[PDB]
Amino acid sequence: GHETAAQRYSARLLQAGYMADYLISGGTGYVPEDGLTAQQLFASADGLTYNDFLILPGFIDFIADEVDLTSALTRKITLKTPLISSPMDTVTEADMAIAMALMGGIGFIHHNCTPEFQANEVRKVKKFEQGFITDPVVLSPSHTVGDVLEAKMRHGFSGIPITETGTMGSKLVGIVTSRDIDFLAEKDHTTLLSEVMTPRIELVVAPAGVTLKEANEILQRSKKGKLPIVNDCDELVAIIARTDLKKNRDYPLASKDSQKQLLCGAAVGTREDDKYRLDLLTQAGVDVIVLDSSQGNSVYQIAMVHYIKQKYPHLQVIGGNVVTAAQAKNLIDAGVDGLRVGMGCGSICITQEVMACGRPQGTAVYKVAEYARRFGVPIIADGGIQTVGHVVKALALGASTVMMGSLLAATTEAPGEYFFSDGVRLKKYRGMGSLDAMKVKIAQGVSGSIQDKGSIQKFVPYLIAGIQHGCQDIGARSLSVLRSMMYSGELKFEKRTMSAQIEGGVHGLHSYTFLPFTK
Amino acid sequence: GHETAAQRYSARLLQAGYMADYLISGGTGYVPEDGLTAQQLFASADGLTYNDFLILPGFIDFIADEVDLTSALTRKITLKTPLISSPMDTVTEADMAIAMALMGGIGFIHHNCTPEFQANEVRKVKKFEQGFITDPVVLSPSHTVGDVLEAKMRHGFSGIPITETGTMGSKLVGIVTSRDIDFLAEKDHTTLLSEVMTPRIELVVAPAGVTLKEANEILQRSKKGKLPIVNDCDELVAIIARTDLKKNRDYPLASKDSQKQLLCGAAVGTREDDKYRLDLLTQAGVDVIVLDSSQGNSVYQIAMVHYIKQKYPHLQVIGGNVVTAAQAKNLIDAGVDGLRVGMGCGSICITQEVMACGRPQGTAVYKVAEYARRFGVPIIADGGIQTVGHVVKALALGASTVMMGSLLAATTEAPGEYFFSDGVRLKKYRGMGSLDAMKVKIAQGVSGSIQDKGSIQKFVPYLIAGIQHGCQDIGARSLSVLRSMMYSGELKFEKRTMSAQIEGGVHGLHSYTFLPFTK
Amino acid sequence: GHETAAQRYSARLLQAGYMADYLISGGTGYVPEDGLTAQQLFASADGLTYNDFLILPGFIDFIADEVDLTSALTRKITLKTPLISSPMDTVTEADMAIAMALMGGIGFIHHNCTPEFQANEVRKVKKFEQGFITDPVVLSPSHTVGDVLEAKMRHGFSGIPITETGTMGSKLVGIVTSRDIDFLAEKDHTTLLSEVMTPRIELVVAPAGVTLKEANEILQRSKKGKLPIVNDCDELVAIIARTDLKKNRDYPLASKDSQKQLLCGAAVGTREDDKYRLDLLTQAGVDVIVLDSSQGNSVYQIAMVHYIKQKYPHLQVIGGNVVTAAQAKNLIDAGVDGLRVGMGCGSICITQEVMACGRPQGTAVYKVAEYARRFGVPIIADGGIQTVGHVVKALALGASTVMMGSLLAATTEAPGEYFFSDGVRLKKYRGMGSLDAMKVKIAQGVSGSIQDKGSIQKFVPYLIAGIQHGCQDIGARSLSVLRSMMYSGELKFEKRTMSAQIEGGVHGLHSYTFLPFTK
């Protein structure tokens, strides 16, 4: 479980110089009751959003850096950070999904594209970091230096083993890399690869049947960039690459599978066409699926959940969008591994004033997460996240992970180009029901634009530090402890009037210019 | 000289199927006279700035890519691009001066710092790209792997040759790079370098007395990252690095000296302390000096020019902001190698409303350049450059090179950090007389801010393409040809009314959003 | 006469190592001709104001601090600084007129008050600093301590010699100062002054007929605060105070008469009642008069000039507001000692759009000053002064002194109270024809308000440094040299288009925040 502020304070006193007290209660020391429990905050029957309340501070006995951010994404997937990139076309193709998985989150690739385009973007994510490279790019020695330059420009790899037949079943005859084609003149599409390859007699190679770690130490001490792995009959089984040891060293939080590939999610719809799409995504090695709709409690979605679970039984599935326990029930009972929570919140959205449907997002996260914990199901809080305070609030109210759109939009890894809208660098960010990119055909999104924020690799550690410092002022050692304090009634809340929201902001200053983080 | 639009058109006709005409004039064909000559434009005796006139289009017989942008900076320095970074604290330290020299321009490092700080920033520029590295980092084999990690942390160089003294006056015992320290655990500051160095029996080395091209080919075919150069007694004379062959390939315009180091300029003032400062800068290998002032026609500046030309007679000197021929005369006669032109123009200025002094910048560039060409002296047009049209206008009016402040400010290579003030990503940009960074002490600058523009290496090729397309539309094959057409009276101009400046902008559109450049 | 930039440069060359040239011209060296002469700038026959032109920079061979700002106010009055405070009720009563005279300018007290109020404000200016105090506060010994406190609260003078009769026509019996009444409790209005005065046997005194300097040395070595001056029969002739030696040390520019009193001016109108008002002002010891009217070329003003000159022939008179040489003629011919120049310029003014009359102020200063110098008459440039650049321009065009309203308004010495208008400290500033203060009775001014600027004693040295630095970039060693360069054609001007005025200011910065001066 977790240890109370009174228990922690009592323990820190017992570690220093400064009786019948244990017999009166014991462990349950006196704390004066102040603020509201989450049960009491939401018993009000009013629509509260992240701006309408505050979390009261606790007792601190740890540094903010010791705060554990480990989170369940689904019944079976754990991420080292609570952060998810939202499956939108102006947010997340492979560049974003790689950057999020490296920083210890995940991305879900968007589906405003062909099945083959989406499966190729998933395949680009899964190939970025590797244990054994088991389907390497291979060439026959009868190819040309111009074919190595073409391969480098088509895939992006220079380290190409050369086997007789030209596949990973033939016999190894050499390797080509950058430093044996890099200096070559315009005689590229004439010089045969046998003229440039480092020949198989020169190679450091390892016998096939070595663990990844044994092979890593062999590669590591060889001082080479590639190590070929070869069976008894001297045939190319796999390669490994020293840049993947560097990627490991460079990114200590990265979300990886057992093959040391980055985790990737993808979106699909609930149409009959989405089954073929799902077949290609599972061939591409996708780790988790979001089903993707305004209103997830439907016969169409409940059918698609049952199909995915009958066909790919090891695959993880997240339920659509829900905002009530009555919606969450039918999807949990259909057998989803997580739920996405939010309807009409989201910076680009107009669904509440178009459809009349939605819910205030603080209430929705609390009500759906409180229902879902009864079955062990994780919640994603989706949309309305404008600040690190909204992330800490979403997590404190019972969300396991937080999904962001506009906060990750106009980073360098978000799709498209900047275009300098109106005296500001200012990138495009749209919404998936925008009618800008998809019978009267009603819009539910608004095609806006967002200020430049630079790289995800510089912006996500600012989110992580803000979440850890928020947990420290609360007195929570981890996100699991934070949610345990909330369901126990130890975590206390205060409501805000309008003037309380105003005094929480910046007041009657003339000029105002905050710098977010400095490194 | 150059060939005229009539001559070019007549030659293009002679190349195709489509008499006594040559005898009437010959070569000088009829063109109807339209617009003004530059001498007529400025004979008006009104203060014209870059917005108050236009250049009329010519005859096109070449592609916008064939346009030669080569420019004289001084009597003896030529740059492959007309572009200079202004010596200001919020614009140009070594990161900017490296980026500008790589893209074929130059930077002048600012002097709002100590003599040792400025000479160290010059030394960082000169060390970034190298022919023979003659003063490499060297260690003795009695040093420890923790010293190599410290040398990487302090200097930035992974590849350290090892000699028995630990200096380049000694026999080479081997080499240490990253791939023989990169995997090491916390036993770094105990393990000796003799346990990790690739010994001199394993090395590829070349005999001292090779040319740089011979040494390049030896290094290149060796496939190693370093080649040590050694004398007859096996002592380390120099090293070369394949990193510099890559830098060369990657940056085809880069402004370099005979030692293959980047060119760097620096600023100094006209005080007695600037004599010592100049000595450190010349020890650091500075290529050119700006004497830096609001008003360069002074006894103090004319003394400093004579001092520099007596003490360092091979150093290049630029005269320090003149706007009249009468000012330019005394500095040209004192023996400067170029002039900086502009006074109280420049985005951060208040000099004209504080001092009453200045001149309108189109007029000043024309008057000073037309006087300076009589003596063969190049002009830098400085300040007021808001657009690529202002660059093309400055160059057409007789400037050899253009110096920019605010246009290069708030790039990634400009000094300082971004601070997200008011829904805009901004960087700090001030002016050198701004009283925010330096007797009543009057201000001449204003401490503003500028919006983010990303990297110089992405923004300067936009300037280059805009300058070449501007030349193509004019009908000029090079910037020398453009200035030759101007002094000959072939290049034609039109004055603009206020309404003409309005119709040259964007009109009564409701929304408006231009993408500057795409690829 | 002045010495030319060519002559100065040639002299600086003769001071260092760096023939027939003197014979070709001699002293008149070659300078390339650039810009316009003032004669040529105004020959254009368009209305130029201070914003429509610039002064071209010269040759510098002195530091900006060597610049002499000495100026003629009238035919017979000289001030150590060109600066005058404008006779308006929101600008100049005695506090402002003292502060301006101390910083080496002058103030003219306003006449929107009673004759006795104006003469009392003049008397407050004249009493602030003193040589011999010839009419001191004197009390008789039959008086109380309560009388000494009432005198201190009615005049402000704590040091009171005690003579028998209680007037200067009597024997001295002691002195009372603050230090021998300050500790007394509230039993004040009982105790006789003979109980508290330092008696005449204890006093250091000097014999009548000592010069002011001899008396200064006696007071100085005595270490006392006062020195009484006494005749041979031991009667009180005068006192002097060490406070005035401190004031003298503290204000080295202060505008003083031969009795070491500050200079003061006053306004009067041209009604019959102004004849009585003038008699009180001359009894108060006023130094100079303004005749204060929108249009000074009137039969009423020419009558009042002849009256003042026939009655008070030693008094200095400034003719009213003129903008043409044809107006200036009839007032110079009536016998004025200076002229005020400007009509409809002035920040609070509406005369041009109400009356159709006025003139552009650059043209008016030039045309009136060029006419007035033929007779040796000084010009005051009045109104439209927004910057130190406008002061330098007005002086360069031929004004001897500059008179300011809105620039001195909302200082601490300007009349009235601050009242914090709209989130800014913001004081009132009205105009004298404003109908806010005073048959349809037409308004000619606009009852506005101005930002706080602190003390005149902190703001006028900023003006002085700005004027001196402006003269230095022009190459003028004094204001007389600046006007000599202008009438000779050595001083050169450039006109400004609209875009030229725009590039002289601050450009497309996002934020902008200049600090005027730092001390």
Ligand SMILES: NC(=O)c1ccc[n+]([C@@H]2O[C@H](COP(=O)([O-])OP(=O)(O)OC[C@H]3O[C@@H](n4cnc5c(N)ncnc54)[C@H](O)[C@@H]3O)[C@@H](O)[C@H]2O)c1
């Ligand atoms: N969460 C929100 O607040 C919200 C609101 C609007 C849109 N969106 C987003 O925009 C996108 C579009 O959402 P959507 O709800 O319009 O997509 P959707 O395809 O789920 O629903 C659109 C319509 O198609 C119907 N439909 C779906 N599957 C069907 C099937 N098999 N047979 C017949 N009809 C079927 C639905 O009932 C609905 O009427 C998604 O990316 C979604 O996440 C989100």
Ligand SMILES: NC(=O)c1ccc[n+]([C@@H]2O[C@H](COP(=O)([O-])OP(=O)(O)OC[C@H]3O[C@@H](n4cnc5c(N)ncnc54)[C@H](O)[C@@H]3O)[C@@H](O)[C@H]2O)c1
């Ligand atoms: N070009 C412009 O329009 C412009 C205008 C204002 C300021 N600036 C910039 O701001 C900075 C400061 O310019 P500045 O003109 O104030 O610097 P500066 O050092 O040239 O001049 C400052 C003052 O010191 C004096 N001075 C200079 N050397 C002297 C010496 N040896 N002995 C005595 N006095 C001496 C000058 O005459 C001047 O009064 C520079 O970076 C300059 O480029 C540029």
Ligand SMILES: NC(=O)c1ccc[n+]([C@@H]2O[C@H](COP(=O)([O-])OP(=O)(O)OC[C@H]3O[C@@H](n4cnc5c(N)ncnc54)[C@H](O)[C@@H]3O)[C@@H](O)[C@H]2O)c1
């Ligand atoms: N300088 C300016 O541009 C300007 C413009 C308007 C007002 N003011 C100021 O307003 C204040 C009021 O003065 P004013 O400008 O109204 O002019 P004013 O008070 O001198 O005269 C007002 C009117 O009365 C007339 N008048 C003056 N003396 C007269 C006499 N003896 N007999 C008969 N008629 C006589 C004038 O001709 C005019 O019509 C002054 O402080 C003046 O300087 C200044």
Ligand SMILES: Nc1nc2c(ncn2[C@@H]2O[C@H](COP(=O)(O)OP(=O)(O)OP(=O)(O)O)[C@@H](O)[C@H]2O)c(=O)[nH]1
């Ligand atoms: N060479 C190679 N690398 C692959 C392949 N599939 C994935 N990769 C990844 O691509 C990277 C290797 O790129 P290379 O071009 O071979 O050369 P490198 O020096 O190892 O990597 P860089 O430093 O990025 O150039 C590693 O991160 C591999 O995991 C493949 O078929 N061949």
Ligand SMILES: Nc1nc2c(ncn2[C@@H]2O[C@H](COP(=O)(O)OP(=O)(O)OP(=O)(O)O)[C@@H](O)[C@H]2O)c(=O)[nH]1
């Ligand atoms: N070749 C290769 N080896 C890896 C990779 N990631 C981990 N390993 C190896 O497996 C070991 C696993 O230990 P860690 O590095 O602590 O755990 P990790 O989660 O796999 O990797 P990190 O992302 O660095 O935490 C490493 O020491 C490496 O030897 C990878 O991408 N490629």
Ligand SMILES: Nc1nc2c(ncn2[C@@H]2O[C@H](COP(=O)(O)OP(=O)(O)OP(=O)(O)O)[C@@H](O)[C@H]2O)c(=O)[nH]1
């Ligand atoms: N080691 C080394 N060799 C260089 C460097 N720059 C040029 N060289 C070599 O010197 C020769 C110069 O030819 P270029 O490269 O065509 O001309 P460059 O002006 O020196 O370099 P570019 O900037 O590429 O034009 C070639 O053999 C280059 O490989 C450098 O930084 N380091």
Ligand SMILES: Nc1nc2c(ncn2[C@@H]2O[C@H](COP(=O)(O)OP(=O)(O)OP(=O)(O)O)[C@@H](O)[C@H]2O)c(=O)[nH]1
């Ligand atoms: N090794 C080394 N490089 C130097 C030195 N002075 C300048 N350099 C430059 O530093 C750069 C990188 O040096 P290294 O770290 O040794 O070589 P590198 O491994 O190719 O550099 P990266 O690939 O960028 O890590 C080259 O461009 C050299 O020209 C020096 O003393 N030693």
Ligand SMILES: Nc1nc2c(ncn2[C@@H]2O[C@H](COP(=O)(O)OP(=O)(O)OP(=O)(O)O)[C@@H](O)[C@H]2O)c(=O)[nH]1
């Ligand atoms: N008591 C007295 N003596 C003064 C005063 N002003 C000047 N003096 C004296 O008269 C002599 C004048 O010398 P300065 O003070 O250098 O010249 P100044 O022109 O009178 O005054 P400044 O312009 O203020 O320097 C000195 O002996 C002064 O001490 C004053 O207000 N009171």
Ligand SMILES: Nc1nc2c(ncn2[C@@H]2O[C@H](COP(=O)(O)OP(=O)(O)OP(=O)(O)O)[C@@H](O)[C@H]2O)c(=O)[nH]1
């Ligand atoms: N005492 C006195 N000072 C006068 C008189 N008329 C003008 N003053 C001026 O007022 C100042 C002297 O004021 P005091 O009240 O005597 O006191 P103080 O000696 O200045 O001492 P503090 O006011 O405390 O600095 C000097 O500058 C005098 O020139 C007068 O009748 N008596």
Ligand SMILES: Nc1ncnc2c1ncn2[C@@H]1O[C@H](COP(=O)(O)OP(=O)(O)OP(=O)(O)O)[C@@H](O)[C@H]1O
């Ligand atoms: N396992 C190996 N055994 C022997 N030689 C190898 C092996 N792997 C690569 N080589 C050779 O080593 C040299 C360097 O290749 P490596 O992969 O280490 O660097 P690279 O990626 O090509 O160089 P760089 O990083 O500078 O671009 C090449 O000549 C290559 O053919």
Ligand SMILES: Nc1ncnc2c1ncn2[C@@H]1O[C@H](COP(=O)(O)OP(=O)(O)OP(=O)(O)O)[C@@H](O)[C@H]1O
């Ligand atoms: N001239 C040389 N002769 C022989 N071996 C060398 C030579 N120069 C470097 N080495 C050795 O070759 C190996 C690779 O070094 P190299 O400089 O080529 O790559 P690196 O820059 O260290 O590799 P990386 O780019 O991956 O960081 C190291 O073990 C190094 O000690």
Ligand SMILES: Nc1ncnc2c1ncn2[C@@H]1O[C@H](COP(=O)(O)OP(=O)(O)OP(=O)(O)O)[C@@H](O)[C@H]1O
């Ligand atoms: N000429 C003089 N000879 C002798 N005593 C004097 C003379 N002038 C003043 N005194 C006496 O000297 C003492 C100090 O006088 P002073 O004028 O310096 O006092 P003050 O101005 O009130 O002092 P403070 O500046 O501290 O307030 C008083 O007791 C005063 O009566």
Ligand SMILES: O=c1[nH]cnc2c1ncn2[C@@H]1O[C@H](COP(=O)(O)O)[C@@H](O)[C@H]1O
């Ligand atoms: O067009 C749309 N209409 C309605 N909701 C949308 C639309 N597109 C995406 N969303 C939701 O908006 C969320 C992102 O919200 P944001 O982080 O506040 O910008 C997504 O994850 C979706 O749940």
Ligand SMILES: O=c1[nH]cnc2c1ncn2[C@@H]1O[C@H](COP(=O)(O)O)[C@@H](O)[C@H]1O
């Ligand atoms: O404080 C200052 N006042 C006036 N001119 C300055 C100041 N600092 C720099 N400058 C000039 O401003 C130029 C840059 O102008 P910009 O490119 O328009 O932003 C510089 O190269 C200098 O000549």
Ligand SMILES: O=c1[nH]cnc2c1ncn2[C@@H]1O[C@H](COP(=O)(O)O)[C@@H](O)[C@H]1O
């Ligand atoms: O009410 C008014 N109407 C017209 N002109 C005025 C009025 N009051 C003062 N002035 C003029 O305005 C000048 C001050 O102008 P300023 O310095 O620009 O504010 C004064 O010296 C007068 O000449």
